[PDB]
Curated annotation (Swiss-Prot), chains A, B, C:
Example GO molecular function: identical protein binding
Cell compartments where the protein resides: Cell outer membrane
Quaternary structure note: Homotrimer. Forms mixed heterotrimers with OmpC and with PhoE; other mixed heterotrimers are also probable. (Microbial infection) Trimeric complexes with colicin E3, BtuB and OmpF can be cross-linked and immunoprecipitated.
Annotated domain remarks: Each subunit of the trimer has a water-filled pore with a narrow, elliptically shaped (7 X 11 Angstroms) selectivity filter which has a solvent accessible area of 30-40 Angstroms(2).
Xref: InterPro entries: Gram-neg_bact_OMP (IPR050298), Gram_neg_porin_domain (IPR033900), Porin_dom_sf (IPR023614), Porin_gammaproteobac (IPR001897), Porin_Gram-ve (IPR001702), Porin_Gram-ve_CS (IPR013793)
Name of the protein in its database record: Outer membrane porin F
Source lineage: Bacteria, Pseudomonadati, Pseudomonadota, Gammaproteobacteria, Enterobacterales
Main location: membrane
One Pfam match: Porin_1
Keyword entries, A-Z: Cell outer membrane, Ion transport, Membrane, Porin, Protein transport, Signal, Transmembrane, Transmembrane beta strand, Transport
Residue ranges, Extracellular side: 24-38, 67-82, 101-134, 160-171, 196-210, 236-252, 282-291, 316-330
């Protein structure tokens, strides 16, 4: 909500309270999304200040507050800062920002990250260029310096992040994306490569000294219709765990496919139909293994711009004999969202 | 404070900074409330959006920020999300919400949870239906579908919560309350029963496979006068700890009594007089033991609706020979509260 | 930003998103400030309510959200409540507040805590009266009861804080400051002494049963010019660690000197030049050791009151043979700040 706007500075304080619950059989250990209370809330700010007609400064922070913890010991479980960055936009020259933000490859994966509760399986956090990552300096250009309507690009510099965990770490790397949008149509290509850390290399699964990720996207966005498709691959970037051996590391290679079709009815109902499949190749020991594989049927109903509810249903296609131990059961999410 | 209100949506951002300090002798280990700095702050939001004349959506989140930690390692100690839920209200049909909220039995205990700093000893957190609990779906009806002024009820469904701790866990259960309010008078009856988890059953104290809690309340609220009384009992629900053996579990049974009398002077002074007593029965090994037992004298002075100060004084009646080791010393709380 | 102001109560919700990065060679283990992503954000509130013409109530909370953590396990690292207190101001009688706030000696050290990213080396947190501390009751008088323009003082009572760590703990103590400001000039003298806890005394470094800290300040603040100087000493208060022995405790004695010169150009550029030096004396085993020692060259450029960027550069004078193991490398901070 725009709670402030004076002297060229306007702050928008925003957030939401999400009553959320997952239904899956058993202890949801073997299901797709788990089972039980998954309620949570968000709070963040987006500020923008007009330094002059061409120059704009801005910043943004968003935090995630789990609503399913006890006020006991586990109280902080799941809590985190999702985004935190500041930057400047200058006329038709482009924008630049730095801090915790979205890796460039997400410029592609964004296309299909549209399901009501699930979806976007490949956009992992603290995983190089696919989801939010800390320490990214991002330059973005729109309409090619104002000379080409619809042509945009971005280059992104990832600063080394040596965390206590191979999964949450990264070396330096560069990434970039180009996309073009012409009347309801949009196409994107994004790519990034980075160094792996000593610890990432000390892991049992995956072999290499460089991590890679690229994805292409295609979309048709107009007339209440949203159809999107993504395809990408990765090298030693996708984190995987052998539930049997309790071994961990990164997939040597993956080929990912995401499809999403949705329609927005005038009365507020947005039915969704999607398909996701990510398969690892050359996993040391297993060979080829599916990591994600399912159909999605779901629907969101918007009471208005502040209230909505939805049922997301995962028809898991992974089979009970999956070598990594990836879960094979279905999961049904039901939620009620208020937001401002 | 109502920081936003446009297009049928109004957000109220609220909070407070509480400078608080406890005075009790010794290391306050043997006192009622402890001793020392207990300063803390709250921040939360309450949103409400009119979907149409009969339909209302809403959500609420509140967080607790301890103000007595070091910015060092212990920095997060005590911090937590207290409430987080979203829901809808429809004409005279009733409201429904889900998320972290107040158990239904609190509809009763609320009556006496009115002391300046202490009080409400039996409304424990993450303890089934008595205080805030995660995963509760709540239906509330007012004025009996609009057919009976003053008659309200609620039914509440508790979703199983399997935490690492028997104290912060719960199985599925149902609860309900009915209350009636007629001109300054109000009476309530609330009740809930739930399954106990394996871990709750693996505990040394308390024996059963079902937890119970019910409380009745009576009040007179009018003419600057507030008098309230509560009585309730519980079965295997009240958490207790043997400080000697360092044993823990739940009381097999408790009988709780709460009394509160207060008066609001025109100039801002609200003196308080209360009495609390909770006694456990059949505790494995000890027999009958008092858990809480004291008199309360306190006063709050309101400078206005945003500023106030108060002195709460506990005249602990527990005696030094209490078998569980419950503290016997007095505690005096002094506070200064700013809020918006 | 002043998001609320009605009925004599005005709330100011404030904060900032700071994209920040440190450049230092090696793994920055041996540098002054470290190396890498240091992005973070702040969020806080300052409320003020006019109880009547002479009486004002107020409160303030500020939190620090690290923007360089993974949403993984380390997610909360660095997060903390910086300030949290409530109080009252009465006509020309003075103000009083309690909670987590700034120790009185900071009334002095504030003078030089003006560098773009570094500086203020001696104003340690949870370290008695020099930085923020929990449990402080503070009385402040301005213009000597309204009888002496420019003459102010404060007395501050520190409540014992027994934390799990000798570094984050403290016993009871009193502190006070007096300062005088006459047309661009200002002079301050501050002092505080407190009891040390058993644990603080159980430490390997430093010897005594009372902690002391005093600092004097001098400043010239006018005409786009800011020149400030501080000098102070301490007894068993300054925390130190022997990186070789991994031993810790407090310096028996320190003599601290801070100098800062800055100029604000009309177009937004504020160049900074500073010098800091803190040296420990009588450290058990080492003798005299420098703790901090460097020159600072830096500059801040204000695009406006909401946006700015800066480069802080530490020319570390500490030498590679420093007995405690204090780092000797340079550090360059670059930041981009949005704020409201
Ligand atoms: C505003 C500060 C920006 C700092 C960017 C640092 C980038 C470091 O490594 C990039 C490797 O690619
Ligand atoms: C909006 C989602 C509501 C989900 C309610 C689940 C209740 C589960 O168990 C209740 C047992 O009583
Ligand atoms: C509003 C409560 C103020 C409580 C102040 C307690 C101070 C305790 O010890 C001070 C020692 O000096």
């Amino acid at each position: 909500a725009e709670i402030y706007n004076k002297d060229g500075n306007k702050v928008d304080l925003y957030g939401k309270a999400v009553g959320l619950h997952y239904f899956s059989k058993g202890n949801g250990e073997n299901s797709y999304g788990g089972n039980g209370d998954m309620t949570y809330a968000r709070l963040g700010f987006k500020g923008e200040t007009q330094i002059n007609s061409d120059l704009t400064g801005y910043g943004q922070w968003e935090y995630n507050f789990q609503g399913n913890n006890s006020e006991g010991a586990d109280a902080q479980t799941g809590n985190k800062t999702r985004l935190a960055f500041a930057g400047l936009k200058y006329a038709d020259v482009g924008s630049f920002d730095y801090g915790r933000n979205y890796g460039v490859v997400y410029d592609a994966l964004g296309y299909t990250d549209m399901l009501p509760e699930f979806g976007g399986d490949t956009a992992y956090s603290d995983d190089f260029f696919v989801g939010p990552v800390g320490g990214v300096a991002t330059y973005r250009n729109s309409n090619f310096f104002g000379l080409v309507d619809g042509l945009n690009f971005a280059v992104q510099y990832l600063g080394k992040n040596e965390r206590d965990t191979a999964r949450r770490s990264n070396g330096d790397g560069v990434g970039g994306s180009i996309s073009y949008e012409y009347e309801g149509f949009g196409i994107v290509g994004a790519y990034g490569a980075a160094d792996r850390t000593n610890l990432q290399e000390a892991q049992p699964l995956g072999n290499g000294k460089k991590a890679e990720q690229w994805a292409t996207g295609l979309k048709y966005d107009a007339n209440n219709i949203y159809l999107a498709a993504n395809y990408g691959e990765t090298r030693n970037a996708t984190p995987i765990t052998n539930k049997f051996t309790n071994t961990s590391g990164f997939a040597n290679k993956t080929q990912d496919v995401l499809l999403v079709a949705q329609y927005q009815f005038d009365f507020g109902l947005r039915p969704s139909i999607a398909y996701t499949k990510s398969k690892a190749k050359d996993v040391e020991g297993i060979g080829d293994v599916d990591l994600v594989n399912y159909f999605e049927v779901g629907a969101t109903y918007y009471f208005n711009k502040n209230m909505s509810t939805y049922v997301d249903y995962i028809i898991n296609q992974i089979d009970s004999d999956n070598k990594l131990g990836v879960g094979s059961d279905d999961t049904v999410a039901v939620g009620i969202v208020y937001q401002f």
